Curated annotation (Swiss-Prot), chains A, B:
Complexes and interactors: Exists in a dynamic equilibrium between monomeric (low affinity) and dimeric (high affinity) structures. Homodimerization is induced by binding of a NGF dimer. Interacts with SQSTM1; bridges NTRK1 to NGFR. Forms a ternary complex with NGFR and KIDINS220; this complex is affected by the expression levels of KIDINS220 and an increase in KIDINS220 expression leads to a decreased association of NGFR and NTRK1. Interacts with SH2D1A; regulates NTRK1. Interacts (phosphorylated upon activation by NGF) with SHC1; mediates SHC1 phosphorylation and activation.
Originating species: Homo sapiens
Function of the molecule: Receptor tyrosine kinase involved in the development and the maturation of the central and peripheral nervous systems through regulation of proliferation, differentiation and survival of sympathetic and nervous neurons. High affinity receptor for NGF which is its primary ligand. Can also bind and be activated by NTF3/neurotrophin-3. However, NTF3 only supports axonal extension through NTRK1 but has no effect on neuron survival. Upon dimeric NGF ligand-binding, undergoes homodimerization, autophosphorylation and activation.
Involvement in disorder: Congenital insensitivity to pain with anhidrosis: Characterized by a congenital insensitivity to pain, anhidrosis (absence of sweating), absence of reaction to noxious stimuli, self-mutilating behavior, and intellectual disability. This rare autosomal recessive disorder is also known as congenital sensory neuropathy with anhidrosis or hereditary sensory and autonomic neuropathy type IV or familial dysautonomia type II.
Similarity comment text for this entry: Belongs to the protein kinase superfamily. Tyr protein kinase family. Insulin receptor subfamily.
Protein name, as recorded: High affinity nerve growth factor receptor
């Protein structure tokens, strides 16, 4: 079976990739845990943590909880918990994804 | 220097991640080359090729040219060239990114 090369393109599509931005600091560096509506959030290939490369001397870390193609099922409270030998902390925000849940998705 | 854990979150932001979907077939599998407005496109961390995992028995490959945070500077023709021992092919589409080029970007 031989077949000459073929290719097809489709017009460009804007996906719906979201970022919940976060910053975490403390010394030593805190361990982290995300909660979604109060329960532990198990990271997947559509929902994961991504750090932005370390800053010059800064001890603080910056990043995103990344959500690819979130729908109403991802609505709710997202909480980042941080803990180290000297204390614990948490921050929470509410997030809703009401974009067209039926739009065509390439990935 | 000791410091208790701290954390800060910002409300969720939808980024502007785009996909130019493509499919490529041929036997043997074709080599590929992208052109942007006629010139070779050098892939970077903001502009890169991403394949969707191989299908069952299918010889054809599917994927995206991914563009993160594209602006008017990325406007133009995108051409995927494919070539193998039995032939060559190409497909081109026009793409324009006119979203707010000044919106806040987490990444």
């Amino acid at each position: 079976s031989h077949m000459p090369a073929s290719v097809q393109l489709h017009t460009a599509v804007e996906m719906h990739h979201w970022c919940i931005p976060f910053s975490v600091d403390g010394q030593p560096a805190p361990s982290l845990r995300w909660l979604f509506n109060g329960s532990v959030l198990n990271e997947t290939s559509f929902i994961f943590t991504e750090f932005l490369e370390p800053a010059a001397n800064e001890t603080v870390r910056h990043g995103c909880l990344r959500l690819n193609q979130p729908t109403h099922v991802n609505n709710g409270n997202y909480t980042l918990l941080a803990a180290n030998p000297f204390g614990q902390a948490s921050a929470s925000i509410m997030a809703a994804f009401m974009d067209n849940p039926f739009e065509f998705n390439p990935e």
